[model samples]
Target: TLEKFVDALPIPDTLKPVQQSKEKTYYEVTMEECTHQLHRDLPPTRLWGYNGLFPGPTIEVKRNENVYVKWMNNLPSTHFLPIDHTIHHHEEPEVKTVVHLHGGVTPDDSDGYPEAWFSKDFEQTGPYFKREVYHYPNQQRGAILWYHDHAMALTRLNVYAGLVGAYIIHDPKEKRLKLPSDEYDVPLLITDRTINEDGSLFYPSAPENPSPSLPNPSIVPAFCGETILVNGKVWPYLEVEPRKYRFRVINASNTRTYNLSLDNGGDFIQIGSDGGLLPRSVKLNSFSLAPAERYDIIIDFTAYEGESIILANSAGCGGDVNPETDANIMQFRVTKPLAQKDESRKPKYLASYPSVQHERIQNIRTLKLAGTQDEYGRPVLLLNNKRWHDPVTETPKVGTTEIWSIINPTRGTHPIHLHLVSFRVLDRRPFDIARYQESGELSYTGPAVPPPPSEKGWKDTIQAHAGEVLRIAATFGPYSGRYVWHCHILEHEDYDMMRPMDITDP
Candidate 1:
């Protein structure tokens, strides 16, 4: 039997012998469900990963290197995550899935074409199945990126069962900066899960009873459990010394938004957002993050005198039945001095290479997210008054710039995502409600327009709030096809909060 908390669930280390600096390599890996010993003697539950680990492995690649990875699947025929066949999906499920290489500027087909999903051993493949060895010509410099299940309706289940992992691109220029290094640089894969007494996952969506607003409504379940996990361990702890530590944090939750802060009230020196390192650092006491987002920050433990601190997520901004919202994610206890130290481990001033900038925006594309009932009276989310399966109305020419005015008519904050390309946040303005009802006009009583911060370099996701207009800009890129954009909140996505975007060139 296992205890509720553990010190560590060490990742089995693997060595990658790089042949050359710019040489491309082929990585033959499998995609399937597997089980392993999580708690004491408890039986392993269903899990999806590249290998046996829940989150597979942390793939490290250098800049300008082409990576060719062949994904293989060897598991039981049964799909791990449950499926509601009635829901509008691609329907051709041999366990339908598309692997979106988040933040990579790759071509559409290699971008894990959503319609190009494949099954089992390639016996079943998508219409756009080109090649297994995806060509990743590391065009962009160093940053923290990740991969997850981008299948039609199965993303919620597949990812919850652990179909996610981190990808870090390193550059020699950033190495010159005196930042956290060696053991201090840790990649913490943060996600949430509910478990039964036996440690198997328990996803209870059906309510005990029905309510007025939700009699036959399609619901978005907010998942929160008693025990919190970091890198697949319950209440795990790490030993730290008096120095700075880089934590590459990713929120893999369904609907939970984390207001990350130190229990002792220290500031988080944020170096990067979702896509890449910020033009400069945003040193804030607390930061907010929605689902499918990432934050790279350094916490200095240099002042601690053998003290313990809690890494917590307390963003219960919109309170509800989820008691686990205020739970601590992990523990860190400083043990005083370390043997040797490197000056590059400090968050000192770093030089710049003008390649990273948020300039030259294109025209604007407005996506208004609304919700109502379908023909079956089943609740559904809509983009421009249409579901995902509806015909594509928003199409832009490739390599042209455009602004995205994402409006969320819903009450809660929705984390929106765009595939294949990254963008910059211009700003968001809250619309006036009283005037709208009286004169049918919209005016902004909010703050004066905030210009796009240099720190807001490039992102694949943006948090859109109710009654607010989220403005962003990016190019349609030359690689054109039917890509997808959606709300990262997994439950909402499973129902119908996503839409496919067709990009073409002039």
Candidate 2:
């Protein structure tokens, strides 16, 4: 059954709309129970998905257009997986959820703050509850984003169950570039999950060590899936023609990191990142992606006729990644003949943005990514040693460039993601973390280590490793009231690793 399912390689279906208009598009997605056969051999596993499909539908929109979506919760009364509500959770827990368009440039009310959750049929909502219909003013450039559940304390469980999909902003300049079009342009949502013997999803939860009190006890360290999935299939395959194809790849795993590469040593022509198009295409043999990160790349299959290439992954940060079962993701077999004349041309330049200079820097902030153990033996991650309810420390002026030196004091690697604007990665240099911890002094160990070529473009998320201070720069505000910056790991984020940022007008 597993072999058959791998051979099947089902491509995901694009979500259709309930209603659409020129001025704005409308979509209503419902979460319901469904049986999905992850492997051809396993029994149909029970799970929750949007419209009964895992890795839900894809929504495409034009830049600067407006779209409205209404998310409905029709899930069962009790959650299938384990849920520990001892953290900062909502009062009622009948499958509460809120839709968040990650990487969207939207207003504060519609940004899907963690507390803005709702139960079945809008029966019970969180304290900061707003309207059900979320309006996304697609004002940013063409990029790949995704929508997922961001409920108060159940984000990990909700996303793990299913609630995930893609959103692409199409730009007119893209048409002029003459890259892959129509069916050639594809979106790949990569994720991983662990299942039980009976085909049910598996998540490690400790009921004996319930949350000590109420400050927060939701963290269970981290989760790494035993099985790697590409667009809802395990080790699937795709048949491709001998032509150029554009792939929008997004990592939707809860906490795992993937260093993806091709088995045949084919290079990835990365054209865009989370925010938008890059200034030029950067070729790379492999790249690492933390949870909730997106990379838009192009691959040319003209040289490998009648050959198959396996997309392999090597990065296994967490303990759950099984090398035997999770090494290979999906396979691409170039079997079909040329259907038509190929006319896609690679441009020397794609898009550009003004560089961040030291003269334009208005303010600098130092934040640390640290963690500690709680009373329940659960790890509690934090930003700048402050809780989520702590007073805001990052207040950037409306039109000023600020430099942030994010120090990672932990032993693990974290992908720090910021909301609203895209930022440029300056460099990362090693520091004496113990000295800084004891005496509050940052002692440099060596010269700065520059980012990889694939990470030179504008990005909303960047990696910070242990014993290093990551320096990044960004300009504040076109429209901002309040936003958040957090570790891309959903478990760390839910357990107190997130902090708010306020944009102010001088």
What are the Cα lDDT values of the candidates? Answer: 0.69, 0.82
Alpha carbon lDDT at 4, candidate 1: 38
Cα misplacement distance, residue 176 of candidate 2 (Å): 0.9
Candidate 1, poorest ten consecutive residues by summed lDDT = 11-20
Kindly provide the TM-score of model 2 when superposed on the true structure, using C-alpha atoms: 0.94
Q: Model 1 off-target regions past 4 Å?
A: 1-5, 9-22, 37-43, 89-91, 205-221, 317-326, 345-361, 375-377, 433-441, 449-455
Model 2 worst lDDT run, 10 consecutive residues: 210-219
lDDT of candidate 1 over 179-202, digit per residue (tens): 787667778877766677665786
Report, for all candidates in order, the number of backbone clashes.
Answer: 9, 2
List, residue by residue over 241-279, the lDDT tens digit for candidate 2: 898989999999998889899989999889888888887
